[PDB]
Structure 1
Amino acid sequence: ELIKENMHMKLYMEGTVNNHHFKCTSEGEGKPYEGTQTMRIKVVEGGPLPFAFDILATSFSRTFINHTQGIPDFWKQSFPEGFTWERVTTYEDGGVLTATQDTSLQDGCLIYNVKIRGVNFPSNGPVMQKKTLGWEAATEMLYPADGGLEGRGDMALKLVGGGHLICNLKTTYRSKNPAKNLKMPGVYFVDHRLERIKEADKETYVEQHEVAVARYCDLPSKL
């Protein structure tokens, strides 16, 4: 198909966090139908970054979600034309990271272009102090709205010394491919496990893995 059992990806990212401008690039592969992917990321401008790379983790891939139980795949269906997402992640200690993403498909490779802005991360907080240790697993809730698809869910950031810092993610997915052509779903969920596999040179190079599965709630129902 357009989306094969193996796919490669390329990414370009520019952003500014607390006044600090940077750029990243990356390349990866995955198995979109098994819901796995790996990305290898390099900071190419503004490095070393004065903030925890972890806050950028979710901005580097919706085509690699394994859809079970017959749930329509909002993302795989949007090709050839692809899709976009817009997100705001709000941290419980004041930090706000907004990101915009275009996903395209050209010459068989998925291309990601990302623009990011973070503001008000507190100076003595663990993001700017670089006292984080990656993300816990998480569940996302998805539902249709105003001609696109909305996601919601909290994530938990692990800290040095133990403990967690929580953020809430609000995401709008919009297909560039005309609505009538995609067969939407109702409410469903996607479980994610995003793990850092390697880093080098104070997070100038980072390798990430994600596995992701879309499913319904399996709990019995009285209705």
Structure 2
Amino acid sequence: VIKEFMRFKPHMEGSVNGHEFEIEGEGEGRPYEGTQTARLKVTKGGPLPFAWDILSPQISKAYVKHPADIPDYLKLSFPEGFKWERVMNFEDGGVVTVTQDSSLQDGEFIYKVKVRGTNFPSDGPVMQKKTMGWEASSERMYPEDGALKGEMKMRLRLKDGGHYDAEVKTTYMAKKPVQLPGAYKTDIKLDITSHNEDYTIVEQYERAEGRHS
């Protein structure tokens, strides 16, 4: 049911510092190669008064290259799919939580994402839009409590040349108890490849590949 080429349709809504928004789009990729692109648009609440970069990672784990000897739990979960929940704790007190449903419907993945951000400083780089994309990350993946967990520190580049850090924890839960893997690592790099001035129209690319740790 997962072909070498698969499209996906994300819908994301929520709020950051009280600012509500909705976003839609369409993407495509090669799940076994760990590669994908997407076209996103802000359909409600645009232009966003905060950095697009905090939303970009809440937008696809069926697209991670896995070696044969590591069970690809999240691909295996299809077609029913899986859900995931995330917390990002930013270094200046900003927090984002996320809940997400992923399913496979009529040959395309469907993503429903709910995002809540709060406690970002008004003069911080998120609310002032001083960010410039994520450095590559490595997510530590491990089974726990009958779910698949991921842990990573993520690094946002700043316009001034510094960095702005987040500690991130995600739980990924298949809708059926397909095979959990052992502990491993996933290397991920997300790039913003195009955007309009005020980021109401955005394109992104991500590559992700699991490996033994």
The TM-score, its normalising length taken from structure 1, stands at: 0.94
Distance 1:114 1:21 in 2: 14
Distance 1:156 1:184 in 2: 28
Q: Deviations over 1:54-101 (max 9, x none)?
A: 000110100000002521101010012100000001100111000000
**CA apart distance, 1:189:** 0.3
SS where residue 66 of structure 1 aligns? coil
* Other-structure match for 2:170: 171
Q: How does 1:1-223 map to 2 (within 5 A)?
A: 2-68=1-67, 70-177=69-176, 179=177, 182-217=178-213
SS where residue 63 of structure 1 aligns? coil
SS where residue 38 of structure 1 aligns? strand
Distance 1:211 1:167 in 2: 20
SS where residue 76 of structure 1 aligns? helix
Distance 1:154 1:148 in 2: 20
Distance 1:204 1:129 in 2: 16
Aligned residue-pair number: 213
The TM-score, its normalising length taken from structure 2, stands at: 0.98
Q: Give the number of the structure whose alpha-carbon radius of gyration is greater.
A: 1
The answer on whether the counterparts of 1:75 and 1:83 sit within 8 Å (CA) in structure 2 is yes
- How high is the sequence identity, in percent, across the aligned residues? 55
Distance 1:96 1:112 in 2: 22
**CA apart distance, 1:35:** 0.3
The structure 1 segments of at least 4 consecutive aligned residues displaced by more than 6 Å after TM superposition are none
Distance 2:127 2:102 in 1: 29
**CA apart distance, 1:171:** 0.4
SS where residue 54 of structure 1 aligns? helix
Distance 1:175 1:77 in 2: 8
Unpaired stretches in structure 1, ≥5 consecutive residues: 218-223
Unpaired stretches in structure 2, ≥5 consecutive residues: none
